Amino acid sequence: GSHSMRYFFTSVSRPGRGEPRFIAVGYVDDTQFVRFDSDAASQRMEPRAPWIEQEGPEYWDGETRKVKAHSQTHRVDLGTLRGYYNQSEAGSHTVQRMYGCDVGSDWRFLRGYHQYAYDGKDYIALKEDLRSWTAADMAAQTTKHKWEAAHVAEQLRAYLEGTCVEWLRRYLENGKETLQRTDAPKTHMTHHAVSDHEATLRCWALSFYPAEITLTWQRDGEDQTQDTELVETRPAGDGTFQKWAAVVVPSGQEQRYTCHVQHEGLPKPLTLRWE
Amino acid sequence: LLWNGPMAV
Amino acid sequence: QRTPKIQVYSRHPAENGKSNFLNCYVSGFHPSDIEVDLLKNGERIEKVEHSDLSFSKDWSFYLLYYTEFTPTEKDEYACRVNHVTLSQPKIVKWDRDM
Ligand SMILES: [Cl-]
Ligand SMILES: [Cl-]
Ligand SMILES: [Cl-]
Ligand SMILES: [Cl-]
Ligand code: NA
Ligand code: NA
Structure with a gap:
């Protein structure tokens, strides 16, 4: 490359x-x-x-x-x-x-x-x-x-x-x-309730190489940065890297939110949703 | 391969 | 003087009773002298290893400390960091969700 x-x-x-x-x-x-x-x-x-x-x-x-x-x-x-x-x-x-x-x-x-x-x-x-x-x-x-x-x-x-x-x-x-x-990110989503009416969605990218990656959240197709958290890319310890991005959402509205993953190992970016 | 010629400041 | 950022996490998604690796990644700090311990129920784990010191574009340092471990329902894991910028050691608990 x-x-x-x-x-x-x-x-x-x-x-x-x-x-x-x-x-x-x-x-x-x-x-x-x-x-x-x-x-x-x-x-x-x-x-x-x-x-x-x-x-x-x-x-x-x-x-x-x-x-x-x-x-x-x-x-x-x-x-x-x-x-x-x-x-x-x-x-x-x-x-x-x-x-x-x-x-x-x-x-x-x-x-x-x-x-x-x-x-x-x-x-x-x-x-x-x-x-x-x-x-x-x-x-x-x-x-x-x-x-x-x-x-x-x-x-x-x-x-x-x-x-x-x-x-x-x-x-x-x-x-x-x-x-x-290139090792493309292995991706998945977790869900963590924070009350009876809101929840954290966490989008995970694991075991990827090289370290450069972009994780972004969208709501109804438009980028969202309010109420998000993005951690620094970190080493797994086996030569690959990890990252996650999270967003807080009203419970029941999870389907509005999509996580987008860009990486050299991906011919096209990936989209993830909670379900 | 390392560089062979660092000079002092 | 720049204080360390700390992430404590497992190499693999955790399952209770299944062997794994516990990581403490410290970054963003200066100077490079730093003390990092991994803790099990408050006690320092022995034979912890670490990466070779390197640094980022802004000259701040980063290190990875790691050891094998088995997550369980009852055991608590954490990272304990001391640095010149810290008045007292900072303890970050491992949470398998992060
Ligand atoms: Cl609650
Ligand atoms: Cl929004
Ligand atoms: Cl000073
Ligand atoms: Cl637990
Ligand atoms: Na010599
Ligand atoms: Na100190």
């Missing part, structure tokens, strides 16, 4: 003793496939999907080297940023980094990104042109001048347009049985 590869990195300083906590995870679409945790025993990049286990020792050696290199860069950054912001050595602080690439249905490059945050706020990010930088404040502006002088965007662009896309295609082929399979 249309696809993405993304890596996520978090480093948290520990001022009382020792090095920061460092956690890295890699995804293809909504499927985690590698991880590194500085608290874990292996001290290696580890597989988390079957289709990555076939990569050879050179793969795992190189990804371990690179992810440890990311970890030490973040360790340095935490010290540098404490200085840029004139902060004490007493408190814990956080660096986060996300980067990756999107490809279309034809597996051609669509866009790339690289975003960096300090203490949960934008710090510096690569613009969509893959040449320029967005600096949120004057500390990040110092970083921007440094990365300009060192040609960083050039080699990041080369990675995002090349290596990133090329290995994404490789993973998509090796894991095609799941990564290129």
